[PDB]
Amino acid sequence: EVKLGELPSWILMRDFSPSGIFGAFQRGYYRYYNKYINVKKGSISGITMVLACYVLFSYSFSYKHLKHERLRKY
Amino acid sequence: LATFWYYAKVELVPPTPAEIPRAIQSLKKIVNSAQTGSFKQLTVKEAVLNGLVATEVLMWFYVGEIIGKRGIIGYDV
Amino acid sequence: KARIVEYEKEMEKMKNLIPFDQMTIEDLNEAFPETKLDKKKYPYWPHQPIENL
Amino acid sequence: DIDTAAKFIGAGAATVGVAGSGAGIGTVFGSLIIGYARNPSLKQQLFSYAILGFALSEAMGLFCLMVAFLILFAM
Amino acid sequence: PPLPEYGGKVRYGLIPEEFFQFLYPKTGVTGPYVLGTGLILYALSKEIYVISAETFTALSVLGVMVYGIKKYGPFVADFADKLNEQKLAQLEEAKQASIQHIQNA
Amino acid sequence: NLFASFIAPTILGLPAAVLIILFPPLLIPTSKYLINNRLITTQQWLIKLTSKQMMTMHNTKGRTWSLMLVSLIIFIATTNLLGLLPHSFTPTTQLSMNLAMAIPLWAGTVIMGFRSKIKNALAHFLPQGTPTPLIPMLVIIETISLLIQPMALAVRLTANITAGHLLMHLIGSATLAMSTINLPSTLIIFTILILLTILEIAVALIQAYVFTLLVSLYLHDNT
Amino acid sequence: LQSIIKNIWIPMKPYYTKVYQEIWIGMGLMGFIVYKIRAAD
Amino acid sequence: MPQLNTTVWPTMITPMLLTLFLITQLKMLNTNYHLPPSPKPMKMKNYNKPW
């Protein structure tokens, strides 16, 4: 996996198919869920990190409207 | 409280004039890795790591900017 | 004697039950066939009268 | 135009008549709470009276939204 | 499969401890923090994070979520644990009631 | 300018609103397990509580919708709650979506009350002890009332969640313009903003329970 | 066409065929309503 | 009022239907409540000895 491979061919070795990216998201989901949520005596931070990643995704598309309230002019 | 300065006195210090040859030493190492192009051995884990410290020192430059302008929220003019 | 030896096997089955933490509800309904939800009398969720919920 | 302008004030004013049903509906479902707390065995017969009161109350409220839209669009 | 007993060891409910220990070797302990204060300062200076009304609605909803967590965290914590043990207790009990019944048989 | 937070968000030209509406379910994990983590423990408990508070009044025919209604209150409550996050786009502030939630369910209910029950259904158009001279006026009342039930459902949600968000945004703007002026007044307005955020949290949950309870009561009226 | 109608169409068939029948009739009444709305607009 | 912008309405109608009517429902089905186990300790189809 990445963090270990150092070949620019790795990017083409992957399966860039609908079922490929689907299983890629499903794996990342179960990897997140199993590490932060699917644990007894778990914590709330397993959720807050999703909200912060959600806020950041929200502030992203909302930039095209928030760049007209700029205080400075440069 | 005070433990910040306890650590700051280790890593947050202007570098002594005696360790600048070690700084250019690692500076010549990294330019050597660029001359040969051997940076391809560098697996992405540390590759991101150096990229992160690269963004850090970049941030120190921008921190130097905002204090050079006597303003925080952009240029006051 | 035949009914005795049957109770011994079945007792051993309840004796060596997988602990309850690693038990899927389908594993429980295999252990206690009473806990199963009668999908014939209540086909739709929650498969039981709301009072018993 | 003075007509297109007055239609906004006239339709806006007639909407205030809905404030009567906002209060009348609160009294009905307020008296249902009091009336049911005293004789909870009549729950089904009391509720039958609340809906009748709710309907007749909101009836006068929609007669205002009637005129509010009769002026704004139908005129 | 049994469930692990602890989660991901996150700092400030935003950043997992993997990030700090991953950055600990090169720039020590304060490294991740001085990266953060660097990143936020550059963002709010180059007008990446424009200050607006949404800022103060943010500082309020972040004010309640932090208070709501710091107040009713433990209550929801053990309540969830209590619901588990009670289900565990009732179940293991109905494991004994089988044993005793057929033992009498 | 002011209603920027209600415009359909688009990221890189793609309709990012399709992601935000698909997201809230991602906060309800499920498990075949019999004893599971804290999140699913509490959630499994609340879903049981809600289903007991909503579905109890229903007969055997009504409780068939118990999946839909509990899934409806869990989606609206999670969308409203997520919407209170900064810079979020709250898809319940949209009249489009709320119409698309209120029109089917209200229509699905009255239809199943008109297929069967059609003689009781038309009889529900007149209360029992209604006097003789008042019979004809009281039928045109209800048919208009029944017709505005779905409109009331969607508007009660969009207008309550929109007004709540806009209000928090205005008072928030006041604190900003007050930042460079008297500091205690900034603290007072901020305290007002804090208490308002708490109200918006209580309204987010109530509006979900209200939308659902009204769909439920329509269901009980036709089952 | 595998694991889709296996995980999506079987569990919802009890709902998509007898429970939600009146819902679809309403959903069409909705599409007709939004269509007549977006037509005169 | 952007709520009255009837051009992006189809962008809200569909994924809600894909969430309220398919996905979330598909997670409630996966939240089942089993009948609690009280197997009675009195179940003995017995009979008097052979007389």
**Spans of all domains in chain F:** 1-223
CB-based contact H41 E90, cutoff 8 Å: no
Task: Report the distance separating Cα H11 and Cα H7, nearest Å.
Answer: 9
Count of CB atoms within 10 A of residue A34's CB?
14
Instruction: Report G:2-41 residues touching C (Cβ under 8 A).
Output: 14-15, 19
What phi, psi does F33 have (nearest 5°)? Answer: -65, 160
Would you call F70 exposed, middle or buried from its count of C-beta atoms within 10 A (0-12, 13-18, 19+)? buried
**Nearest CA-CA partner of F87 in E56, E41, E46, H3:** E56
Q: Which residue of A has its CA nearest to F85?
A: A55
DSSP string, F34-93: SS--HHHHHHHHHHHHHHHHHHTT--TTGGGGHHHHHHHHHHHHHHHHHHTSTT---TTS
Query: Which of left, alpha, beta for F12 (phi over 0: left; psi -120 to 50: alpha)?
Result: left
Task: Report the distance separating Cα F9 and Cα F20, nearest Å.
Answer: 10
**Max CA-CA distance within chain A?**
52
- Asked if residue F222 lies in contact with residue F112, where contact means CB atoms within 8 angstroms, the answer is yes
Q: Kindly state whether F21 is in contact with chain H, defined as any CB-CB distance less than 8 angstroms.
A: yes
Task: Report the distance separating Cα F100 and Cα F24, nearest Å.
Answer: 17
Task: Report the distance separating Cα G21 and Cα G28, nearest Å.
Answer: 11
DSSP state, residue G7: I
CB-based contact E8 A66, cutoff 8 Å: no
Cis amide bond preceding C46, omega within 30: yes
- In total, the C-beta contacts within 8 angstroms joining chain C to chain H are 31
Place of tokens 């008042």: F134
The dihedral through the CA atoms of F89, F92, F93, F97 has a sign that is: positive
Count of CB atoms within 10 A of residue F95's CB?
24
Facing residue for B11 by CB, picked from E22, E28, E35: E28
Q: Residue E10's beta-bridge partner residues?
A: E16
Residue B4 structure tokens: 């910040």
The angle, 0 to 180 degrees and rounded to 10, between the axes of the packed helices E53-104 and F38-55 is 90
DSSP strands (E only) in chain F: none
Please state, in angstroms and as integers, the Cα–Cα distance from residue C44 to each residue in A70, C39, F60, F124, following that order.
55, 7, 11, 28
Contacts of G14 in chain C (CB under 8 A): 43-44
Interface partners of chain A (CB pairs < 8 Å, 3 or more) are B, E, F
For A70, half-sphere exposure in the C-beta direction (CA atoms, 13 angstrom radius) is 15
Task: Report the distance separating Cα A9 and Cα A12, nearest Å.
Answer: 5
Task: Report the distance separating Cα F117 and Cα E14, nearest Å.
Answer: 55
Would you call F21 exposed, middle or buried from its count of C-beta atoms within 10 A (0-12, 13-18, 19+)? buried
In b/e form, how buried is each residue of B51-68, taking b as 16+ CB within 10 angstroms? ebeeebeebeebbeebee
DSSP string, E24-91: HHHHTTTHHHHHHHHHHHHHHHTTSS--SHHHHHHHHHHHHHHHHHHHHHHHHHHHHHHHHHHHHHHH
- Asked if residue F205 lies in contact with residue F80, where contact means CB atoms within 8 angstroms, the answer is yes
Contacts by residues B33-42 (CB-CB < 8 Å, ≥ 24 positions apart): B40/A6, B41/A6, B42/A6
Suggest the residue from A33, A61, A69, A71 to mutate for an interface test with chain F (most F CBs closer than 10 A): A61
All domains of chain D in start order, with CATH: 2-73 (1.20.20.10)
Three-state secondary structure of chain C: CHHHHHHHHHHHHHHCCCCHHHCEHHHHHHHCCCCCCCCCCCCCCCCCCCCCC
Residue A61 structure tokens: 């598309």
Contacts of B66 in chain A (CB under 8 A): none
Task: Report the distance separating Cα E49 and Cα H32, nearest Å.
Answer: 45
**Nearest CA-CA partner of H7 in F70, G39, A15:** G39
- In total, the C-beta contacts within 8 angstroms joining chain F to chain H are 89
**Nearest CA-CA partner of F57 in F69, F46, F47, F45:** F69
Query: Which of left, alpha, beta for B64 (phi over 0: left; psi -120 to 50: alpha)?
Result: alpha
CA of F149 vs chain E CAs: smallest distance (Å) = 33
Please report which residue ranges of B1-77 form alpha helices under DSSP H: 3-11, 20-36, 44-68
**Nearest CA-CA partner of F171 in E74, E53, B26:** E53
Torsion of CA A13, A15, A17, A19, to 10 degrees: 180
**Nearest CA-CA partner of E59 in A27, F89, F186:** F186
- Asked if residue A41 lies in contact with residue F38, where contact means CB atoms within 8 angstroms, the answer is yes
Residues in chain G: 41
**∠C30-C31-C33 over CA atoms, to 5°?**
65
Task: Report the distance separating Cα B52 and Cα F109, nearest Å.
Answer: 58
Would you call F52 exposed, middle or buried from its count of C-beta atoms within 10 A (0-12, 13-18, 19+)? middle
CB-based contact D55 F142, cutoff 8 Å: yes
Q: Kindly state whether H39 is in contact with chain C, defined as any CB-CB distance less than 8 angstroms.
A: yes
Contacts of residue E27, defined as CB under 8 A and 6 or more positions apart, other chains included, come to B11, B53, B56, E34
Task: Report the distance separating Cα F96 and Cα F157, nearest Å.
Answer: 11
The dihedral through the CA atoms of A33, A35, A38, A42 has a sign that is: negative
**∠A11-A13-A17 over CA atoms, to 5°?**
90
CA of F5 vs chain A CAs: smallest distance (Å) = 8
What phi, psi does C24 have (nearest 5°)? Answer: -70, 150
Q: Look at residue E11 and give its three-state secondary structure.
A: strand
Residue F99 structure tokens: 């119409």
**∠F74-F75-F78 over CA atoms, to 5°?**
85
Q: Kindly state whether C32 is in contact with chain H, defined as any CB-CB distance less than 8 angstroms.
A: yes
Task: Report the distance separating Cα F50 and Cα F44, nearest Å.
Answer: 10
Residue A40 structure tokens: 């007894």
Give the experimental resolution in Å: 2.6
